Design a protein around this ligand. Structure first.
Ligand code: ZN
Lengths: 164, 350, 377, 165, 212, 54, 54
């Protein structure tokens, strides 16, 4: 529930188990996949959810799929970057964290194409943040001057970075 | 013709129609109003409590076919909601997250028996209890009873007789309007189709809340062929009037002469033959002024008055020459004009 | 009962508060850009001044072991003092630095007498210094700013017991905002070589930034909270209130003052006694704009008087009225445009204003409450 | 507009004596010296009494003084941000360009009374780089409607479009 | 039979009457950041290890909406109509002169409403669609006056479109010393424009049943 | 009967509601971002107040 | 070691007591040896001002 260091709340952790299950005698189609996820810490239960995925595609390269199963760390690295550059321990831009759960729900519509790269890609998913980062930048740099325009243009270009 | 369908408009700044995946702390809207959601709104419209509704009112209301058309599909926003336990007894604080649909609009059509629809529409014009959108912290922004009923046909036909309202001039629009409809029997396609999803929004009881599965189908609509785009009413952007004075239209040219006869051809402060008129209150100009707003003056005194209010920042209440506080400055400016002016320059310019 | 102070000030071209980039601090109010002095700057510059010297009973540092070492005159126990502090709960953040602790200068003697004692262990020493730290909340500066000390617990071995270390604040200082739009400017400087023979040439234009503004300042003191914070001392509370008012009237944040020297004074101080706090910052949603003949300060005071009159006529209740005094230097700036007077008094001397404030608060005298002296050092 | 075009044509109709009269009065108000008030009134008042949307007195006075000291021929498509962008994309981007950018950006925080001197500085920079044309009408309209947001947005957008060619 | 249970709801059936909605600003949000430094009282002049932090703040003009169910409140009090009227008046005072306590010891935003409109109608509504265009400030106005003007325009449009049907609407616009009228002419956009909180509470109470 | 109350309130630079990170609470309406004070924050301030206790 | 000395002198910027009136001087350099007087150019700009400073 809380956003802390090394975790930004994005909801619907469907991308997390789509590497190990697709690596040990499971690289078939068999119709559509269904993930049931129960999340709890120690004794306290946190959440239960499920996700359906159309999985009638072909095989996939291991590197891009491993990059796909790192979206939580990629989004945390996106959020942790501050506005103008201060480092230390800053929470980055919290206004970006408000628009992440909406952009991730739009990506999850085409979740079958995203896994096997049969019409979707990480670079394809990076364009979903463009519609909302402009609206965030109009609020973060509200001045009508000229350096504010350049700051908005530099802030708009933020995209998640795939790391392993 | 007796009415057949009923129309509900659901639109607010925030709204949330919860789903079954909300079990412990995280509460999620699905995408659109559910049958159980709107059949608590209708139940609260006719003042039926959580008890006594399951046995009698719910089975008749659940025997309906409803469909939702979506415009402004909404942006999901999350809220960090804390419930303070204490302020069992502990100083602990419970944390949770709740999802809302921001800037959304849904059109719900419910089709069924005529007199039941008439009773429902009569109840909605003055609801017994408070009406919200999913959660009590979400009031509507447009009236729910906004569209009239009628003897329409099946839900695709009922979701076409409502215009798509706009709000401002450059309001972006979608070419496609997705719609979610209940599945329809008929014994030809008696089995559920392949493209039908299952939703847990068939209400049975409310106080020990009970929901049953319901098969849900999806379709689409296109603006311009099924729904005609409407236009906004009224004025949105507000600006002050601020009418710049005009000295060429007929109404002011007659008001000025009327004022020049009201004062017997004499300047107000220096008592010389007046040749011009100076305003005092500017919030009547453009051709609507009254003779009491204007004061007659000569050339020297009006030039002095113009000098005295060049950069003084007076918007609506300008200089009043009849005021005995402005006499000294006007006289000093008049003395300066008499001492320093050159008639040759003015005669040369015109 | 609340004592509120609203002040109008105008400053020379200077830079009293800057961000990480060096530019003066700004903010947004009313859709336009203002100039800002942060509230933690005002509080620190007030509490560290020659007018608040007698009431500086608190200290804020990470080097408490250095205070313990300097409190004695031997080789001391400096290493195990830091070990005890690590055992306390002031753990090193990412294995570096310490945690800010606000504590009275009086109770450091107990720390010296407890840590140096050899008839105990490290755990009992840590528990004892925690107990004496949790009971160091009797100082005039700690009674206004308030305290919140909470260990990260990462080093709580279930052996050190902690207590109520939070002190509810009594003073709420707002961020100072300009009454007009903000016009920042850039001063250009070149450092000159003292040797006449340079035999070289290159542009070395520096960059400094400054601005001049008319600031509106707002303070608030809870009288009933100050009595509970100071355990029931009316004389000490009255002395703290008077010294705070006198310091806030005649102090400025010591920013870039060796190069700008902008020690200006307020042109209006309004002190009001209320039951619920009210801020008059809404007077300046419309920015003040200069005209053909005007002081910036006179226009700002006129706008303040207009909004004060509107609020008094609008939010009026006979159950709890408000009585306030207006001070200007020798009545230079009357409250308004010589019309619609509101203030119950018109003081022309600052000392008389503080005396009247104390007289209304408790009937005390300023020459009488100076006898309540806290730790000086 | 038409009051602005007539005002600019009347200003360019002046000769050396009246231009010197206006040039002696830079940095001053309108209600101070009688010859300047007489000249400006005789140039502006018929246009105001004819056209309802003529420029305001302060804006027209400011443009009159700027034309007096910085006489540039009227041409269309030579607005101030366009020429500032053309000049700015010729210097090094480390020291001089931020200075000129800050000088250009100071104008957004100033009202119409305190704007003769920064505009004089910008036009002096323009004159130092061998410029002989300017759009006086567009500048007059922009100054007339200045506190709005879309006008400043178009100002900065024109500057960016000229700068990033 | 306490007011704090009947009106607000359960402490922690008993269906309440309040409909406090989310307060949404009438313009673009402008979040700002502050670079504070935890300074040390002891000089030291060594071991810097920069103490730069960041804290976010904002300033906005919020539009707040409340609703009260009279029948539900009366049923909660089982007939004490005078107590119901007193609770309505107490809430009208409290919701006007109470602010959240979040970070008020460092920012002290103790501001007051610049206009309260009390309405009576059958169907519920919220005038949130008035500020679909963010308020842009101009030379001869401030943010508050433009927000009130947009509210006046929306009220004018609603009363031109949704009115009559044997159900006239009643407004009770209030402003401190009448410094912010709700529009100009158009039957003053509502009933009497009054300039005192006590007069507003009295007007609503005497409208409901001619109470005290 | 349904009494409705509408208020317009301009606030000084402050931070009255917070997320789990520290920023002021926001929302989206009309194509921009708007600062928001939550519903349950306002209800808690009205309740348990000295005005509502007197 | 410590290389910081607190300055004992504070000097403020000198501001005029009236509205500034900047002026421009148009110099032109002259060629001592006679040449071609056909647009000698070199119209310069020297900004200067006179003010009563505090
Ligand atoms: Zn006369």
């Amino acid at each position: 529930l809380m956003s802390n260091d090394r975790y930004t709340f994005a909801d619907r952790d469907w991308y997390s188990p789509l590497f190990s299950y697709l690596h040990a005698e499971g690289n078939s189609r068999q119709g559509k996949l269904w993930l049931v996820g129960f999340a709890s810490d120690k004794a306290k239960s946190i959440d239960i959810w499920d996700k359906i995925i159309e999985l009638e595609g072909t095989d996939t390269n291991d590197e891009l799929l491993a990059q796909l199963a790192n979206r939580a760390t990629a989004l945390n690295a996106m959020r942790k970057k501050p506005l103008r550059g201060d480092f230390k321990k800053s929470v980055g831009t919290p206004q970006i964290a408000d628009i992440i759960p909406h952009a991730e729900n739009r990506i999850a519509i085409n979740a079958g194409k995203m896994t096997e790269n049969r019409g979707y890609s990480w670079q394809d998913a990076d364009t979903e943040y463009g519609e909302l980062l402009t609206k965030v930048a109009y609020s973060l740099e509200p001045a009508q001057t000229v350096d504010a325009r350049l700051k908005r243009g530099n802030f708009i270009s933020r995209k998640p970075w795939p790391i392993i | 013709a007796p009415p057949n369908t009923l129309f509900l408009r659901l639109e607010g700044a925030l709204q949330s129609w919860g789903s079954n995946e909300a079990k412990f702390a995280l509460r999620r809207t699905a995408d659109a109003p559910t049958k159980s959601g709107v059949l608590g709104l209708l139940c609260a419209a006719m003042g039926i409590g959580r008890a006594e509704a399951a046995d009698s009112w719910l089975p008749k209301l659940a025997n309906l076919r409803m469909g939702v058309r979506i415009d402004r599909p909404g942006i999901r926003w999350w809220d960090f909601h804390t419930v303070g336990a204490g302020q069992k007894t502990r100083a602990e604080t419970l944390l949770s997250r709740r999802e809302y649909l921001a800037d959304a609009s849904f059109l719900v059509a419910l089709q069924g028996e005529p007199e039941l629809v008439a009773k429902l529409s009569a109840a909605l014009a003055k609801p017994v209890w408070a009406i919200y959108l999913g959660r009590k912290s979400c009031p509507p922004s447009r009236p729910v009873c906004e569209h009239p009923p009628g003897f329409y046909n099946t839900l695709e036909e009922a979701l076409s007789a409502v215009p798509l309202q706009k709000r401002w001039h450059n309001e972006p629009l979608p070419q496609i309007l997705p719609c979610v409809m209940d599945w329809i029997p008929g014994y030809d396609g008696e089995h559920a189709p392949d493209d039908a999803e299952i939703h847990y929004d068939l209400p049975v009881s409310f106080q020990p809340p009970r929901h049953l599965p319901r098969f849900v189908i999806r379709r689409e609509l296109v603006v311009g062929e099924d729904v005609q785009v409407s236009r906004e009413t009224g004025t949105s952007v507000w600006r002050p009037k601020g009418t710049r004075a005009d000295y060429n239209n007929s109404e002011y040219k007659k008001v000025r002469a009327e004022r020049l006869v009201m004062d017997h051809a004499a300047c107000m402060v220096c008592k010389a033959p007046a040749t011009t008129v100076q305003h005092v209150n500017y919030r009547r100009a453009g051709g609507k002024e009254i003779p009491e707003d204007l004061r007659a003056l000569c050339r020297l005194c009006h030039d002095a008055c113009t000098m005295l209010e060049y950069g003084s920042g007076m918007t609506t209440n300008r200089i009043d020459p009849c005021d005995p506080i402005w006499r000294e400055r006007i006289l000093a400016k008049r003395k300066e004009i008499v001492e320093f002016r050159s008639r040759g320059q003015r005669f040369r310019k015109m | 009962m609340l004592i509120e102070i609203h002040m109008i000030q105008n400053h020379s071209p200077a830079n009293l508060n800057r961000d990480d980039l060096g530019a003066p601090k700004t903010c947004y109010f009313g859709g336009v850009l203002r100039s800002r002095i942060s509230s933690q700057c005002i509080k620190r510059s007030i509490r560290t001044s020659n007018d608040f010297k007698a009431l500086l009973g608190g200290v804020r540092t990470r080097r408490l072991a250095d205070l313990i070492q300097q409190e004695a005159g031997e080789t001391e126990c400096w290493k195990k003092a830091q070990e005890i502090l690590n055992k306390c709960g002031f753990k090193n953040k990412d294995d570096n630095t310490k945690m800010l602790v606000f504590m009275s200068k009086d109770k450091i003697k107990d720390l010296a007498r407890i840590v140096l004692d050899n008839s105990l262990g490290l755990t009992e020493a840590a528990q004892q210094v925690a107990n004496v730290i949790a009971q160091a909340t009797l100082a005039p500066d700690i009674a206004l700013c308030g305290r919140m000390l909470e260990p990260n617990d990462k080093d709580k071995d279930k052996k050190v017991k902690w207590s109520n270390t939070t002190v509810e604040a009594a003073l709420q200082v707002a961020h100072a905002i300009s009454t007009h739009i903000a016009r920042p400017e850039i001063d250009y400087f070149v450092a000159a070589d003292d040797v006449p023979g340079e035999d070289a040439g290159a542009g070395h234009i520096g960059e400094s930034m400054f601005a001049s503004a008319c600031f509106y300042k707002y303070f608030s003191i809870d009288w009933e909270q100050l009595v509970k914070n100071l355990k029931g001392d009316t004389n000490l509370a009255a002395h703290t209130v008077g010294a705070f008012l006198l310091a806030a009237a005649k102090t400025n944040p010591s920013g870039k003052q060796n190069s700008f020297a902008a020690h200006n004074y307020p042109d209006g101080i309004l002190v009001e006694f209320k039951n619920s706090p009210i801020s008059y910052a809404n007077a300046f949603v419309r920015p003040v704009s200069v005209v053909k003949e005007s002081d910036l300060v006179e226009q700002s005071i006129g706008q303040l008087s207009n909004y004060v009159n509107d609020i008094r006529l609008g939010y009026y209740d006979e159950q709890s009225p408000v009585i306030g005094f207006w001070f200007s230097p020798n009545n230079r700036y009357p409250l308004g445009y010589k019309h619609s007077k509101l203030a119950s008094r018109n003081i022309g001397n600052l000392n008389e204003l503080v005396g009247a404030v104390l007289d209304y608060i408790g009937g005390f005298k300023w020459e009488e409450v100076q006898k309540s002296k806290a730790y000086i050092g | 507009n038409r009051g602005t075009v007539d005002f600019i044509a009347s200003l360019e109709n002046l000769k050396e004596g009246d231009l010197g009269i206006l040039r002696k009065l830079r940095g001053a108000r309108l209600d101070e010296k009688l010859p300047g008030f007489d000249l400006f009134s005789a140039l502006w008042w018929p246009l105001r009494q004819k056209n309802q949307r003529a420029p305001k007195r302060e804006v027209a006075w400011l443009i009159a003084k700027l034309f007096a000291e910085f006489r540039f021929e009227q041409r269309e498509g030579a607005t101030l941000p366009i020429l500032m962008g053309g000049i700015c994309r010729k210097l090094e981007p480390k020291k001089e360009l931020p200075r000129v950018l800050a000088r250009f950006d100071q104008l957004a925080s100033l009202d119409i009374m305190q704007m003769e001197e920064p505009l004089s500085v910008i036009m002096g920079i323009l004159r130092k780089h061998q410029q002989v044309c300017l759009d006086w009408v567009g500048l007059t309209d922009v100054l007339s409607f200045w506190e709005q947001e879309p006008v400043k947005r178009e100002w900065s957008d024109s500057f960016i479009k000229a700068y990033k060619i």
